[PDB]
From Swiss-Prot, chain A:
It is an enzyme of class 2 (transferase). Component of a complex that contains two dimers of PRK, two tetramers of GAPDH and CP12. Belongs to the phosphoribulokinase family. This is Phosphoribulokinase, chloroplastic. The gene is PRKA. It is found in: Plastid, Chloroplast. Disulfide bonds join 14-53. Pathway: Carbohydrate biosynthesis; Calvin cycle. GO terms for biological process: reductive pentose-phosphate cycle. Light regulated via thioredoxin by reversible oxidation/reduction of sulfhydryl/disulfide groups. One of its GO terms (cellular component) is chloroplast. Changing residue 62 to C: In mutant 12-2B; increase in substrate affinity. It comes from the Eukaryota. Keywords: ATP-binding, Calvin cycle, Chloroplast, Disulfide bond, Kinase, Nucleotide-binding, Photosynthesis, Plastid, Transferase, Transit peptide.
From Swiss-Prot, chain B:
The lineage of its organism: Eukaryota, Viridiplantae, Chlorophyta, core chlorophytes, Chlorophyceae. The keyword Nucleotidyltransferase does not apply. This is Phosphoribulokinase, chloroplastic. Its EC number is 2.7.1.19. It is found in: Plastid, Chloroplast. Its main location: plastid. It comes from Chlamydomonas reinhardtii (Chlamydomonas smithii). It is an enzyme of class 2 (transferase). Keywords: ATP-binding, Calvin cycle, Chloroplast, Disulfide bond, Kinase, Nucleotide-binding, Photosynthesis, Plastid, Transferase, Transit peptide. The gene is PRKA. Pathway: Carbohydrate biosynthesis; Calvin cycle.
């Protein structure tokens, strides 16, 4: 009894559904859309978790947004009143009839009723934008992909740049970017945990194949404690190479230490590079402390359990796994 | 009951004016009891004997005295001025168990004096400029240590202890460094290529310092020896930079910075432990020692308590005292592995 509410702020086409899956996979069972409902539903339900895509609170459909000269990232194209009221209702056990934004058609279909679940996760562009809705959340997570990695991935995820031609878009970026930097990006300032994806510093990479990944964690919350190694509060650089874990061409380099995040006190855990044999992160894991793992090789076990996922060989999957375990910690800390 | 324990030979290569004494006192203090000159004998004798340790200063094997070398156009650093045949024989003659009549290079008189009898100790320590120069001597030693002070720090130390305040002399006279440097580069400094452990003392990288007051200190440990195992930090065989928390190790500026990692020492494979900077409260070094492994300590505060015992020594607040202490515990472990 009593429902826990997690917020995940992330962009489209930069790995939020993989992130989502890792976090739900810790409570076991893969969330799936309603059984008979809309085939284009954005919701996913499992025994323990229920994930809601915040697009369903667009107050204007695709064409309604087009005539007003507004993008999907604009606050005025969101219905925060309804989003607040409905998130609150699900928290207080009450069920909710919630619209569906049909990404295929571009129209706002009809609900879709939602039962209040053990953990409700809301994911999208504006989980922390509305102060009423933010105060509703027990844990705030932001996935920050830098523009260089974002805009390398799309010039490829777009179909090996099969369209539109050469490049030339590149200006699908220009349409979304200004709203992104004004409305979506500032939300990472009050996140409790941030995963930041940067270009590697080990080797030259025009493809975003090799990533520098930073897990930034707020100090001083009763809901969670930051992970560290090998000594909390210190500043460490750590090359694990070369026995213990195989590292091929671009090596591995860990960093750990205190930093400051928009005036706020944070500890940072960082990885640059790529594992090549996906055991041996237990090597890494055994030196990580405060991971909120319940048994010895849990991080390695979950990452094993999700092997085919993207980002399973670099810092993305690892730090997303750790943050999943912190989500369970927040729930257990709260329901007993 | 009958016998008998046979001798362990440690060699230390060090220039003078670099804290060879402090290094020696830290190393003999592990075994207990301050060594002392032989009561009774030559007033200028260079030996120091303890129940556990006997320390021979290899100047006592100078095959030409002070006006020798003058006549021959060489310095005390040259291989021409040493009698490596005597050195081999008496060192051979103290390890297997005999006693020797060893000359006394009187250091004030400049002359080699009448020998003093030296008996086979539990631990023999030969110390000075040429402990590893001759190959027969070096294979007689069970552990080889080299103290490597870089030119800049030597420079900056002699500039203090002499001239530029502190001492008496001129700035110009302080290029007797100009002499002597050709011999040190040529005959002394290469002996560190073969050492088992090397303590290198370099300029700091944390703060500008022209006086040699703040030190970057390196303990370079040869890999793969039956006689000892290198120290390590957090995780053996990795590469690590570590700035301790500063709430847990109180430091004014510049602070402190550790480094641990594999490296290459003259084409040989070594483990390197580094400390840069200075710590202000010696008791908190237990925070550092808490993350070292294979220190050859017996209980757990031993390095910290060994240093607190000798807390008035030079180097007690930087990497010099720390790593010198650790080498002493590794000399103890060499001796224990042999006699068992």
């Amino acid at each position: 009894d009593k429902t826990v509410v997690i917020g995940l702020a992330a962009d489209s086409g930069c790995g939020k559904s993989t992130f989502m899956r890792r976090m739900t996979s810790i409570f076991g069972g893969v969330p799936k859309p309603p059984a008979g409902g809309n085939p284009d539903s954005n919701t996913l339900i499992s025994d323990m978790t229920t994930v809601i895509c915040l697009d369903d609170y667009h107050c204007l459909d695709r064409n309604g947004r087009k005539v007003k000269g507004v993008t999907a990232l604009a606050p005025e194209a969101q219905n925060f009143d309804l989003m607040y009221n409905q998130v609150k209702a699900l928290k207080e056990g009450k069920s909710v009839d919630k619209p569906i934004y049909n990404h295929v058609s571009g129209l706002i279909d009809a609900p879709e009723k939602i039962e209040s679940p053990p953990i409700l996760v809301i994911e999208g562009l504006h989980p922390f934008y509305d102060k009423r809705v933010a105060e509703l959340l027990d844990f705030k997570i932001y996935l920050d992909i830098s523009d260089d990695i974002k805009f390398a991935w799309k010039i490829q995820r777009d179909m090996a740049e099969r369209g539109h031609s050469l490049e030339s878009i590149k200006s699908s970026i220009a349409a979304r970017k200004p709203d992104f930097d004004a409305y979506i990006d500032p939300q990472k300032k009050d996140a409790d945990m941030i995963i930041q994806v940067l270009p590697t510093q080990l080797v030259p990479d025009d493809k975003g194949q090799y990533l520098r990944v930073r897990l930034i964690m707020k100090e001083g919350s009763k809901m969670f404690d930051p992970v560290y190694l090998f000594d909390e509060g210190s500043t460490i650089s750590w090359i694990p190479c070369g026995r213990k874990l195989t590292c091929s061409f671009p090596g591995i380099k860990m960093f750990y230490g205190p930093d400051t995040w928009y005036g706020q006190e944070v500890s940072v855990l960082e990885m640059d590079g790529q594992f090549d044999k996906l055991e041996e992160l237990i090597y890494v894991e055994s030196h990580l402390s405060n991971t909120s793992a319940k048994f010895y090789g849990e991080i390695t076990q979950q990452m094993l359990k999700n092997s085919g996922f993207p980002g399973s060989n670099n810092g993305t999957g690892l730090f997303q796994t750790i943050v999943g375990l912190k989500v369970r910690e927040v729930y257990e800390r709260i329901v007993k």
